[PDB]
Each structure stands twice: as C-alpha cells, then as structure tokens.
Design a protein around this ligand. Sequence first.
Ligand SMILES: CCCCCCCCCCC/C=C\CCCCC(=O)O
Ligand SMILES: CCCCCCCCCCC/C=C\CCCCC(=O)O
Ligand SMILES: CCCCCCCCCCCC(=O)O
Ligand SMILES: CCCCCCCCCCCC(=O)O
Ligand SMILES: CCCCCCCC(=O)O
Ligand SMILES: CCCCCCCC(=O)O
Ligand SMILES: CCCCCCCC(=O)O
Ligand SMILES: CCCCCCCC(=O)O
Ligand SMILES: CCCCCC(=O)O
Ligand SMILES: CCCCCC(=O)O
Ligand SMILES: CCCCCC(=O)O
Ligand SMILES: CCCCCC(=O)O
Ligand SMILES: [Ca+2]
Ligand SMILES: [Ca+2]
Ligand SMILES: [Cl-]
Ligand SMILES: [Cl-]
Ligand SMILES: [Cl-]
Ligand SMILES: [Cl-]
Ligand SMILES: [Mg+2]
Ligand SMILES: [Zn+2]
Ligand SMILES: [Zn+2]
Lengths: 382, 382
Amino acid sequence: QPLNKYPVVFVHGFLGLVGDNAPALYPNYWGGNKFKVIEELRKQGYNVHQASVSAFGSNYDRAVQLYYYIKGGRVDYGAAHAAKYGHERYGKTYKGIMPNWEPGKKVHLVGHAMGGQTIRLMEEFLRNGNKEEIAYHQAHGGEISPLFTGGHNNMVASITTLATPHNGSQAADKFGNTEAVRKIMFALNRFMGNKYSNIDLGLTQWGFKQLPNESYIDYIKRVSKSKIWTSDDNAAYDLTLDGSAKLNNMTSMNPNITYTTYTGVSSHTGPLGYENPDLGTFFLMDTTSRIIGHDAREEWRKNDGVVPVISSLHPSNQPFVNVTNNEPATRRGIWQVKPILQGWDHVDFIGVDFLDFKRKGSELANFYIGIINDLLSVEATE
Amino acid sequence: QPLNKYPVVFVHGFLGLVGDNAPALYPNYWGGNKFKVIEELRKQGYNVHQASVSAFGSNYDRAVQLYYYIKGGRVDYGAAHAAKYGHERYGKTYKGIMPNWEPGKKVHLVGHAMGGQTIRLMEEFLRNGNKEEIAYHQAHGGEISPLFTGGHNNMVASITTLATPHNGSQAADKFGNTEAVRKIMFALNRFMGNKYSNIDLGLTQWGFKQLPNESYIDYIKRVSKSKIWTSDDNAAYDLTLDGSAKLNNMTSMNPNITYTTYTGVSSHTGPLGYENPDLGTFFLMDTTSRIIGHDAREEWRKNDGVVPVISSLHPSNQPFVNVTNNEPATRRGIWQVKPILQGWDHVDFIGVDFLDFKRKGSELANFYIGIINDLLSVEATE
Ligand SMILES: CCCCCCCCCCC/C=C\CCCCC(=O)O
Ligand SMILES: CCCCCCCCCCC/C=C\CCCCC(=O)O
Ligand SMILES: CCCCCCCCCCCC(=O)O
Ligand SMILES: CCCCCCCCCCCC(=O)O
Ligand SMILES: CCCCCCCC(=O)O
Ligand SMILES: CCCCCCCC(=O)O
Ligand SMILES: CCCCCCCC(=O)O
Ligand SMILES: CCCCCCCC(=O)O
Ligand SMILES: CCCCCC(=O)O
Ligand SMILES: CCCCCC(=O)O
Ligand SMILES: CCCCCC(=O)O
Ligand SMILES: CCCCCC(=O)O
Ligand SMILES: [Ca+2]
Ligand SMILES: [Ca+2]
Ligand SMILES: [Cl-]
Ligand SMILES: [Cl-]
Ligand SMILES: [Cl-]
Ligand SMILES: [Cl-]
Ligand SMILES: [Mg+2]
Ligand SMILES: [Zn+2]
Ligand SMILES: [Zn+2]
C-alpha cells in the first residue's frame, strides 16, 4: 500500500511536544502551519509518524523511549542506569507503532535538532547494547530489555538529521545548562506534573507527577529531594559541547545505514568577524545566536540561531562526505553532508517561524518531499 | 522652568492603555522599550504628559474625556448626547493636569492614530461648542459643560497627528466595524468590567462595570440590554471611511493653530499594482495591510499596516501644504504635511514593534525631539 516500504519516523528535539501531548494552544511541531508534514505526506501515500519522547530528558532517556514508541511496551531505562542516576527504572507504556519491529523490518529515522542525537543513541543500543546493563544483569540476574542486549541489526535503514547539534552548542554551555536556567526548566516540569495536568514534559521518571491526594506543598517537598536538580542525565547537559562529545565518543558508523545531515545558517558576519542573527531569525533565538556568534573560536561562530554550523554538519571525527543537492545521497556508512541552507534558522526546518515570510510553505513542502525522495532512493538501492 | 512654555499632551489612539490603567504585562504605549517618550523628554527639561482616555469609545466620548483629563473634573458627555445614544451622562473624574487651563494658557496636542481625530474634535468643541447640547440646555435648563458652550479660543497652540486615519481606514469598514468583531470587542469590555478588574477599557458609561454583589450571570443579562451593541457611538464606527468623513464635515481649521501631520508607509507594490505589507510590518497588521492594499481604488492602497497613506496625510476636505523636513513647521491654519516615513508602520511611530530591528531607539528619539523642536518654534513665532 504505502509508497515507502519502510515507515518514516520523525523525531522531535529538545522542548518539542507533539500530538495529544501538546498544550491546548501550541505550534504544530512538524511543519507549523506552513507544511503539515505528517498529514500531507500521508495524503500523498507515504507511511510516516511523529515520535513522542521526553522533551527535557537526556538522549539516553529519549533513545529508550524512542525504542518503545516504535516497538510498543513499558519503557525500561535499565536497572544500572536507574540506580546510577537516581530515577525510576520504568516509565510510560507505549502502544507501539510497529509491534513487529525486528531484524528485517526496517524504519527510516529523521531527527530534528536533538532528535538527531537521540536516533544515533538508539541505533547504538540496538547494535551494541548497553554494557553497564549487560554487566548488571550478568552480576545480579533479573530481566534485561532487548534494547540493551545488542545484536539487533537490519532495523534502521537511514538516519537523517536536521540542524542537529552533533557537537553540542554554546547556547547550552553558556545558557541552557547554567544553574539558573536548569532551575527554571525543572520548575516548569514540576508544575506541569501537577494533578490537573494533561501534558508530559518528559521528566516524570524523576518524581515530577503529583499524586491525586498529595497537596502541592507536599509535592514540592517530595520532588526537591530528587536527583534531577544536580544530575547530568538531562537534555541541557547533553546539548553542551562536552555532553555531545561523550555521545560522539560512544557511537560508531553502521555500514548498512544511509546517513545524511542538513544544516542552516541564519547569521551574518560583522566588521570584527563576529556573527549576528539575520533579520528573520525567529526572535526567541536572538540572544542565543549572539552568544554563539561571539565565540573566541571563529569556526564555532556561524549558526542557525541556537546551533553552530560546525555542530550540525556531522559528528566531529566521524567519516563524512560533502554532497550536492542534486546527486543521489545513497552512500552507506558515511555522513552525507547536504549544502548549508542559507537563511534557514533552527526552527525554519520545522516551519514554525510564523514571523518569517521569506520561508514559504511550498519551499518547506519541497524540502520534506526531497527527504522522502532520498529515502525512496535508499530503498531502491538495497 | 520647563523649556516649553506650553505643556505637551500626547493622546493615544484606539486600543491604547497608559500608565496605571495598563494590564499587568502590556507595552509602554509612548515609545515601547525603544524610547521612553514621557520619561526621556522630561529628563531633557520638557513638560510633557500622556493623556488617558477611552480605548474603545467614540471620538466624541474620548474628546470629552481629553478635556477633563487636562482641565480636571467629572466627565460630562452632555445630556443630549447621553439621551440620544443611551449611555450615562457622567463618567470618571480626573484630577486634571492643568486646572488653570483657560484662554491664554495654551497646550500643545499630539495624537497618535485615533488620538489625532480626538484632538481635532475636542478643539472643535472648545471653539464652536456643541449645538445640540446648547439647544438642550436652552430647552431644559440644568448645567452645561464649559466644553460645549463655544467661544473658547487661544487654548490650543498646535495639533500634530501621527498616522491618524483622518479619512478612515478600510480595515475598520471591512473588519473592525463588522458585527462579528464589534461583538468580540464589547465582550472584552464586558469581561474587563468584572468586579475584580483594575483596568478600564473605556466603555463603562455603557454599563460595563459589574457591581460588587452582582453575579456574572446577572451582569451578562443586564449589559445585554445596553445600546452599545448596536450603536455607532464607538471607535470602530468612527474609524470607518464614513465615520471619519462625518468628523471632517463638522470640523474646521482654526487660523491660530499650527497643524502638522506625519504618515508612514510599510507596504510595497506587487506586479498587479496591489500593495502588500513589508517584512517588518508588525505581524498583527499583516491581514489589515493586505485588505487596504487590495483596494479597488489605487490611491487607497499604500498603507502603514492599518491606515492608508491618503487617510493619514490630511483630512480630505481641509487645506494642506506639503512641507519639507527642514522647513520650520510654523504656518498656522493649514495642515503641514511632513514627508512620509519610509518603512514606518502604524506602531513604529510609538516604538512598540519589538520585532523590527530596523527601527531603532535612536531614530525614534530623533523623531520625538524633532516634534518638540517644531513645538518650540511654534512658541517662538507667536
Ligand atoms: C529553555 C532553554 C533553551 C536552551 C537552548 C540550548 C541549545 C539548544 C540546541 C538545540 C536543542 C534541540 C532541539 C531544538 C528543538 C526546537 C523545537 C522548538 O523550537 O519548539
Ligand atoms: C480589534 C480590531 C482592530 C481593527 C483595526 C481598525 C482600524 C484602525 C485604524 C487606526 C486605529 C487608531 C488608533 C490606532 C492605535 C494603535 C495602538 C496599538 O496598537 O497599541
Ligand atoms: C510565565 C512564567 C510565570 C512565572 C512564575 C514563576 C514561578 C517559579 C517556580 C514555580 C514552581 C512551581 O509552580 O512548582
Ligand atoms: C483570549 C481568550 C479567548 C477566549 C474566547 C472566549 C470568550 C467568549 C466571550 C466571553 C465574554 C465574557 O466572558 O464576558
Ligand atoms: C491565530 C492564532 C491565535 C493565537 C493563539 C495561539 C497561541 C500560541 O501561539 O501558542
Ligand atoms: C488555583 C488552584 C485551584 C485548584 C486546587 C485544587 C485543590 C486540591 O489540590 O485539593
Ligand atoms: C487578563 C487581562 C486582559 C487584557 C486586556 C487587554 C486590553 C486591550 O487589548 O487594549
Ligand atoms: C472563576 C474564579 C474566580 C471567581 C470569583 C467569584 C466571586 C463571586 O462571584 O462572588
Ligand atoms: C503550559 C505550557 C508548557 C510549555 C512547555 C514547552 O515549552 O515545551
Ligand atoms: C496585548 C497584551 C495583553 C496581555 C495582558 C496580560 O497578560 O496582562
Ligand atoms: C462575578 C464573579 C466572577 C467574575 C470575576 C472573574 O471572572 O475573574
Ligand atoms: C489588529 C489585530 C487583528 C488580528 C489579525 C490576524 O491575526 O490575522
Ligand atoms: Ca526564520
Ligand atoms: Ca515595523
Ligand atoms: Cl527487538
Ligand atoms: Cl503529567
Ligand atoms: Cl474651560
Ligand atoms: Cl474596571
Ligand atoms: Mg493533552
Ligand atoms: Zn536517565
Ligand atoms: Zn457617547
């Protein structure tokens, strides 16, 4: 039936909420009002989905959730990980989009921003498992998630990243991950865990769900003991240069996977060689753009608003090849880096910059269809 | 010892709330965060004020309120007017900014947008009074406001208008004044009349104040009988082409007053000769800009977002002269029309377009100081 033989799963980044989990008023993540990615691609006969994973959690937590989003079942972050970081072992349970997902039944993975890192980690787990969990289950018995065992291949056809901070962002190091702003984020998470909340910001495994008969006062007191407040097992840490380097250091290339990256630039050079945001950079990224743009290291300056070009092109010191827009992007095992999209800020990739009339719905439609064409090419050249 | 011998009163337009009457979070009307008109002009030694008058009411109601804001005392809309339109005769009471205001002790009046019409009407009443009120008091005795008597000259030195719809706006005829949107506006007014509200949207004379012991249910029922719902005595009517023409038809030039207008353009011509909003037009005016810009009549197309250029230049039936930026704007009795400000949308005049980095604080400071320079020269050439 579907034009694509392998389902396409779109994976949101940091802060992203999709589907039923999005607030009463909130942007449509995948395409804004410019091009409704899921609805329009389905209309054209493609089998596509938008994953729903933790908005504030670590790449680790998100990758586990991605696995269960696809496969179905109760999220298991692993006994060793849970014990190390101090959060629940078990999380939400997903219906599962492909309950029969197993070697042979592949999926295409496309990540926006942090979603691009989450996708890399999950594939890491399928192929190589998680050594701390393998060791823990060796030593202590129990059950180990099949996600953590290793030896699961032929499950992902492709990894495509849009404005992914593969090498981290100074906007995390110098803003997102500062103590002051972690506190803001964690307070939001505490609040949206209240007993009248219908939205899950992705840190409930840390205790941020108020019980039906618990007072707010008691809730505050209970969750102030959580390790979340000082942990590095969260998104803000993972998005720093160091946090992202750690992920780069534990990933490897899969020779069967087609890897491709897209990157935008939305800054311009000033007289001193610093980068400032273009008019048209979605305004909430003006300061973050300036922070990145004023880096001491010149090659870390050009940026899409919140991710420097050098972070998005490809993980540092993984194999890559610069590719043209026209040619087949059908090489396996190597990051195919697409030419930089001029004027595209971080959120232009998902169409939510409603203030930017230069970035048209029809342009965004062509961009997404071009990704699907590449994915079809991957399938055709198996 | 202020530098200006006559106080300057700045008069906000439609929707404008100032000072104590502005919501918890709300822009600073005169200058935004770009150039704090009142505070900065005072720092430079000028005696300036921002009037507070009805945000949603008619030019008539607003002109009465402006009078009392300056002079002090209990607002009196006039017995005849109250009876004709079906609202209270008496309104709020103002401390008064110049309790000694009288022939000889003059004020400079500067109006943004609708404020420019309000200022014209008030001066009309001072000079020629209000015949229906004079007649009514003749017939029925009682008191008549000094505002409605006529014969008050030498009270206003100058009328300066910024982006004033002297000839109305299609955005009112085709949107603002439609039944569906009057209902929205009147509902907001009903709500902000609730017994916990600290902000006055300027329609309380129509019944929109909930009593301390009145239920919301009873309030709804009581104010649905008000004539506001079907009256033309409101801002939305007055801003239409017809509503503004009516004001033009009953006002006249005062040969002792210095008149000056400023106008902005923030649209550009397309291939069919229609006008579309520039990038940089504050986004909430995008649709209104397009409605104006697609007018059948070509000369009614160019616009600042919500006011077409031909509306802002001068009242269509009144004498004007095009003036250069460098001419002393000291001719009396004739609309001195200042060269159009290219790239200035309707709200760039008051500095609130926080999304538009092309329009800088230092530019806005020069613009306001230039108005004060003109006002000084009016005083010097008496
Ligand atoms: C609240 C603090 C913001 C800190 C910013 C840190 C750096 C961010 C780099 C990229 C993060 C990952 C995905 C970005 C997703 C964008 C989604 C959205 O705008 O709704
Ligand atoms: C809610 C409906 C708005 C419809 C627009 C009608 C036409 C408006 C023409 C000029 C309006 C007069 C004063 C404009 C004052 C602007 C103040 C502000 O934006 O904070
Ligand atoms: C739009 C932001 C509103 C500002 C509220 C500040 C509250 C700070 C921390 C609140 C934590 C909580 O409510 O559990
Ligand atoms: C800005 C929030 C929008 C909510 C729209 C619903 C309101 C309908 C009319 C309300 C009238 C009233 O509450 O008196
Ligand atoms: C035309 C859309 C109406 C504005 C409400 C949407 C609020 C939001 O952006 O979250
Ligand atoms: C402004 C708060 C309104 C709802 C509080 C619910 C009371 C409870 O927790 O038992
Ligand atoms: C909950 C606060 C209500 C804000 C009213 C805004 C008035 C205006 O638009 O002029
Ligand atoms: C809806 C939240 C607050 C309503 C207050 C009611 C007061 C009253 O009507 O006596
Ligand atoms: C009530 C609104 C919560 C917004 C959560 C977010 O920014 O992802
Ligand atoms: C135009 C701004 C309205 C916001 C009103 C408030 O939240 O107090
Ligand atoms: C009349 C009691 C409720 C009105 C106040 C409010 O809606 O906040
Ligand atoms: C002046 C306010 C009108 C809102 C029009 C819009 O958002 O399309
Ligand atoms: Ca943009
Ligand atoms: Ca503007
Ligand atoms: Cl499996
Ligand atoms: Cl929840
Ligand atoms: Cl008087
Ligand atoms: Cl009130
Ligand atoms: Mg919900
Ligand atoms: Zn974790
Ligand atoms: Zn009235």
